[PDB]
Design a protein around this ligand. Structure first.
Ligand SMILES: Nc1ncnc2c1ncn2[C@@H]1O[C@H](COP(=O)(O)OP(=O)(O)OP(=O)(O)O)[C@@H](O)[C@H]1O
Ligand SMILES: Nc1ncnc2c1ncn2[C@@H]1O[C@H](COP(=O)(O)OP(=O)(O)O)[C@@H](O)[C@H]1O
Ligand SMILES: [Mg+2]
Ligand SMILES: [Mg+2]
Lengths: 570, 551
């Protein structure tokens, strides 16, 4: 694969050094059969003894140097593949989070994680082991064939001619083996389906008392299977015979041709000893190489499936480019109609018209199922309006930078979530830098977490689990309000903030919203069903469904005699 | 461990009739091994001849002995592999038949508490992976036992002095493996923890990305994932470093013996106690023993690890049934009376919640009764007690001054059959499903009993015979939605007592089975159950059921 090879491009210097060290180790490893032949011939020739003290020393130095260079080469290759695996897992993770929120839909939680965590590690482990073994044995197979041409020119032609005879016939008869084993496995599944069907209706079987009929029906399929596997045992007997006669008759032909060649005066008897010891090493080198090849062939196709997933393109705009100072904070909604990208054929929102002026309160109340939480998600950059204009200081949301905008607009969800970290880190989550210890306490006092977490023995450094076992419902909403308040945002959105939150915290959130001087620099939007909170709201909107039915202040809506009074008295 | 000993002894006793196949396989394995370790000895004989005065008589005789041992060893190895895979299939067919025959005599509490998918996996797939435990392990074990003895026997014949040099370094290989496997198991625990911490970040970020995207902290999850990847990387490098160091030590220790073996080989063969071909025979022999002794020392651990899959199959076969003790009856003449008193039956699956309370009623040979109940009051529950399908936990059912548990398995159910709201149609033909439960003598009774409901128009219109195939459930049945076929099945066996759970209904126009139309000829009792209170034509007894109570 071109792009997989192009991924491993910066490690060309280390890959070149690894190939050299493998060649130097493979050359030095083939020393013991190559030195057995001369020393045995030297005694039979009645030679001098001034070489035996040196030839054994030289042959031991070579394979010792081959052992170390194998260890150094295996050390480098294991180090470089580790950095590649760590780099590939990081980049496939960052490509996942860059897609739009439509792709997730709270249902791909299992398939995405199997594609990021499970497959990537198993693919790189298969690549790092099979390519290492394929490269090690290919060099050993090539080096042995290089020196077998040197020792003889006739016997090395014989073993190359009969090598396809060794490794093509067992494959062909092997194809006959599971061709008949397919029918045995198929008949085994068919017999089990009959027995299961006769067992699931057991009250019908027990009422008629026909267990002997089911025993005979099960036995008929077993006798047909017993006929079929008798041919299976014959097929393996032929298959196991022909993989063992070709291997051992090859050694006879090598020795007999060598027996004819030695007696002609071409090579000595000791040169045949080296060639005999090279046959068994070359045969296993070929056999290991052929078994490796199905593993790499399948794994390359799996890597092409991950690589096509890597270049998935999103549908949302990437980010913005403008960072201003002295933000106004007013956000204008003008003819905004939104449809869910899951089901674009049905419209779920249309005809919104309001303005969140700075320093005032605009709270919208609607019945159950009216679809108000999708409006608050539309306020930030979670989704996009299909046919409307969303204006924030004269500019749309994608025109602003992703990191700056969400630091300026903070919101809590209908169901707040708690990450498994320290509560000091979870309060200041998402911030560019960690603030001082006093600013966290100032944000926690305003939210009300300091009135409860002071009693905990762990202080502000308590460790919490993955999802809400240590913190209660009141505590989860208490740490959620502190999280959206530490950054001091310009637009604050609360969704069911006081649904389960305690009465003392519903108290001091009211002078914060209505009496505190900090409301002058923010524009707030509330979606709450509590009638004891929207009395001092400057703008009140009614969302019965789809679009706004009516809107106004507190006194105007009561004097109008609309649906707002009817919902209040209920 | 004593838990795996009882399962191994039962599994060994499961292969009792396959002893002649195991003996022949062991005999063919010994001959195949003996042929394999004899060719390298003859290989040293040819090199011995080639280095001296050449004579073609012994050289051709040596080659002819290579061919005779080559055909002999290949035929012995070929017949061994075929015989082993025939035993594997014959063992598999025996355990599968024994399991289903034992499972057919189990109570209905087992078939409703346990899913049918679980029984399918323990019958179709688990017994295939369980049957091949013995032929795979016996082939591996008996190969390494003979070959190690065979090769070391060939060691001592060549050179007793040079054998002991390679016999006194095997503890070095064993000590190297023992110290390496302990360190490798400790590192693997750390890798599993670090890969669990890496997955912890992905549980946090992917599942709650709505909170992450709404605060602009997607780069924080990317940065936090790099720390988890670096810790997994460092542990991966330590695992690869300790593995590569172990291979270097083992290869060096193996080399030092080979250098020492050859150095004593050249010195001994110089003086005249060895030949050139003897050294070649010793070198080829010595490389074979190194791998096979390592398989032999670690076969018991692999065998016990793979044997831990027969617990579920052996528990299903040997579990105790809940059926009561059967007995004999009087099948000479039957008076056709059923008596009932003080039922307090509850399901064994749910003994806490009862279904039927104390009620009594009787069935008469010349009378027909009716049972009416709105819903969930024991409509077909009473019908399950009469046919000995379920046994009461309170009170009993009588049949002419004797209970139902002492009746035999065959004659009681042949005289009492019933039809329900869901008539299950089994695989096969129409004739096989009309006369299900009958051993024989159906070839002269199907044509007179299938025309009970509305003669024959559904079957007579096509194929002009009863041999029309049906298939599985959900098939081409259109005779009143496979209801006409079920009632005609009931009247084949001419039972004395018939229970109709959800008969008549919209097919009450076909009323040839309720009154004298079926019963009242001689003595015959019919029990009728209806959902809505329809007026019982020619009624004799009216019973209305409400929460296990009747008026
Ligand atoms: N991802 C989604 N894609 C498509 N439709 C969705 C999706 N999530 C929710 N919905 C549906 O669209 C509706 C839009 O309503 P929305 O979620 O805005 O209401 P809500 O304010 O959360 O509800 P409530 O009345 O309980 O306060 C939901 O009630 C639900 O039926
Ligand atoms: N197979 C079963 N296993 C356990 N309880 C059952 C079973 N079938 C029915 N019951 C219980 O027995 C009560 C009576 O059911 P019943 O009226 O006999 O059903 P039907 O009307 O189908 O004959 C029901 O309330 C039900 O909860
Ligand atoms: Mg909502
Ligand atoms: Mg019923």
């Amino acid at each position: 694969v071109r792009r997989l090879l192009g991924c491993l491009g910066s490690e060309t210097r280390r890959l070149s050094l690894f190939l050299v060290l493998v060649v130097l180790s493979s050359l030095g490893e083939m020393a013991i059969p190559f030195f057995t032949g001369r020393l045995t011939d030297w005694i039979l020739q009645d030679g001098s003894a001034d070489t035996f003290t040196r030839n054994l020393t030289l042959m031991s130095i070579l394979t010792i140097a081959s052992a170390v260079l194998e260890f150094v080469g295996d050390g480098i290759y294991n180090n470089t593949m580790g950095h590649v695996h760590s780099h590939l897992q990081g980049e496939v993770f960052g490509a996942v989070l860059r897609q739009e929120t439509e792709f997730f839909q709270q249902n791909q939680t299992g398939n995405i994680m199997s594609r990021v965590t499970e497959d990537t590690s198993t693919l790189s482990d298969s690549l790092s082991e099979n390519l290492s073994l394929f490269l090690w044995y290919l060099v050993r197979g090539l080096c042995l064939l290089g020196i077998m041409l040197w020792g003889s020119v006739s016997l090395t032609m014989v073993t190359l001619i009969t090598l396809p005879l060794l490794f093509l016939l067992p494959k062909k008869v092997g194809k006959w083996y599971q061709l008949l084993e397919v029918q045995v496995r198929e008949s085994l599944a068919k017999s089990s389906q009959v027995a299961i069907e006769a067992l699931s209706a057991m009250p019908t079987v027990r009422s008629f008392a026909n267990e002997e009929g089911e025993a005979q029906k099960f036995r008929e399929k077993l006798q047909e299977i017993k006929t079929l596997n008798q041919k299976e045992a014959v097929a393996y007997a032929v298959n196991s015979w022909t993989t063992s006669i070709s291997g051992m008759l090859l050694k006879v032909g090598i020795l007999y041709i060598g027996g004819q060649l030695v007696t002609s005066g071409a090579v000595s008897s000791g040169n045949l000893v080296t060639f005999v010891l090279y046959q068994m090493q070359f045969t296993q080198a070929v056999e290991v190489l052929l078994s490796i090849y199905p593993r790499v062939q399948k794994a390359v196709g799996s890597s092409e499936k991950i690589f096509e997933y890597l270049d998935r393109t999103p549908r949302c705009p990437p980010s913005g480019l403008l960072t201003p100072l002295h933000l106004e904070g007013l956000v204008q909604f003008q003819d905004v109609s939104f449809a869910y990208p899951n089901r674009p054929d049905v419209l779920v929102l249309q005809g919104l018209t309001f303005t969140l002026r700075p320093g005032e309160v605009t709270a919208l109340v609607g019945p159950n199922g009216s679809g108000k939480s999708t409006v608050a998600a539309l306020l930030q950059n979670l989704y996009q309006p299909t046919g409307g204009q969303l204006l924030l200081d004269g500019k749309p949301l994608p025109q602003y930078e992703h990191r700056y905008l969400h630091r300026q607009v903070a919101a809590v969800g209908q169901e707040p979530q708690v990450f498994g970290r320290s509560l000091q880190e979870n309060i200041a989550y998402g911030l560019t830098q960690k603030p001082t210890m006093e600013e966290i306490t100032a944000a926690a006092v305003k939210s009300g977490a300091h009135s409860f977490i002071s009693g905990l023995p762990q202080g502000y450094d308590t460790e919490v689990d993955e999802a809400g076992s240590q913190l209660s419902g009141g505590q989860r909403q208490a740490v959620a309000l502190a999280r959206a308040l530490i950054r001091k945002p310009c637009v604050l959105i609360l969704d069911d903030a006081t649904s389960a939150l305690d009465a003392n915290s519903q108290l001091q959130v009211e002078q914060l919203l209505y009496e505190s001087p900090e409301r002058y620099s923010r524009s707030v939007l509330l979606i709450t069903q509590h009638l004891s909170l929207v009395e001092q709201a400057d703008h009140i909107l009614f969302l019965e469904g789809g679009a706004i039915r009516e809107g106004g202040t507190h006194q105007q809506l009561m004097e109008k005699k609309g649906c707002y009074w009817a919902m209040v008295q209920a | 461990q004593v838990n795996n000993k009882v399962l191994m002894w039962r599994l060994l006793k499961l292969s009792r009739p396959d002893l002649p196949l195991l003996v022949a396989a062991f005999f063919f394995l010994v001959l195949a091994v003996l042929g394999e370790t004899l060719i390298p000895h003859y290989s040293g004989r040819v090199i011995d001849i080639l280095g001296g005065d050449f004579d073609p008589h012994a050289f051709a005789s040596a080659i002819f002995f290579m061919c005779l041992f080559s055909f002999g060893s290949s035929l012995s190895a070929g017949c061994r592999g075929g015989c082993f895979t025939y035993t594997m299939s014959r063992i598999n067919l025996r355990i599968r038949e024994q399991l289903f025959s034992s499972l057919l005599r189990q109570d209905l509490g087992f078939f409703q508490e346990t899913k049918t998918g679980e029984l399918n996996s323990r019958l179709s797939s688990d017994t295939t992976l369980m049957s091949n435990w013995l032929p795979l392990n016996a082939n591996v074990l008996l190969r390494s036992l003979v070959k190690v003895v065979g090769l070391y026997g060939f060691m001592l014949s060549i050179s007793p002095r040079l054998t002991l040099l390679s016999l006194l370094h095997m503890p070095f290989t064993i000590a190297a493996e023992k110290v390496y496997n302990t360190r490798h198991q400790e590192v693997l625990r750390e890798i599993q923890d670090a890969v669990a911490r890496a997955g912890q970040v992905v549980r946090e970020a992917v599942g709650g990305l709505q909170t992450v995207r709404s605060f602009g902290a997607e780069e924080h999850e990317v940065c936090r994932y790099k720390e988890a990847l670096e810790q997994c990387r460092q542990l991966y490098w330590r695992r690869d470093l300790e593995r590569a160091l172990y291979l270097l030590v083992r290869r060096v220790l193996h080399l030092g013996v080979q250098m020492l073996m050859l150095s004593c080989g050249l010195q001994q063969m110089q003086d005249g106690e060895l030949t050139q071909g003897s050294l070649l025979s010793f070198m080829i022999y010595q490389e074979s023993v190194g791998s096979y002794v390592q398989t032999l020392v670690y076969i018991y651990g692999d065998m016990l690890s793979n044997v831990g899959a027969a617990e579920k199959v052996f528990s299903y076969m040997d579990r105790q049934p809940n059926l009561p003790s059967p007995g004999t009856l009087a099948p000479t003449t039957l008076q056709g009376v059923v008596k009932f008193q003080d039922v307090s039956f509850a399901y064994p699956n749910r003994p806490d919640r009862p279904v039927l309370k104390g009620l009594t009623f009787t069935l008469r040979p010349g009378e027909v009764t009716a049972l009416v109940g709105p819903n969930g009051s024991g409509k077909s529950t009473v019908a399950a007690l009469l046919q000995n399908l379920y046994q009461p936990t309170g009170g009993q059912v009588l049949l002419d001054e004797k209970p139902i548990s002492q009746y035999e398995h065959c004659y009681l159910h042949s005289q009492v059959v019933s039809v329900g709201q869901e008539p299950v149609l089994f695989s096969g033909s129409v004739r096989n499903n009309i006369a299900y439960g009958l051993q024989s003598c159906e070839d002269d009774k199907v044509m007179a009993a299938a025309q009970a409901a509305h003669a024959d128009d559904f079957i007579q219109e096509m194929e002009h015979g009863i041999y029309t195939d049906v298939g599985e459930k959900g098939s081409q049945l259109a005779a009143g939605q496979k209801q006409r076929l079920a009632i005609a099945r009931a009247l084949v066996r001419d039972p004395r007592v018939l229970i109709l759970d959800e008969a008549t209904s919209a097919l009450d126009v076909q009323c040839e089975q309720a009154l004298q139309d079926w019963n009242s000829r001689g003595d015959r009792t019919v029990l009728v159950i209806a959902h809505r209170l329809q007026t019982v034509q020619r009624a004799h007894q009216i019973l209305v059921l409400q929460e296990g109570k009747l008026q």
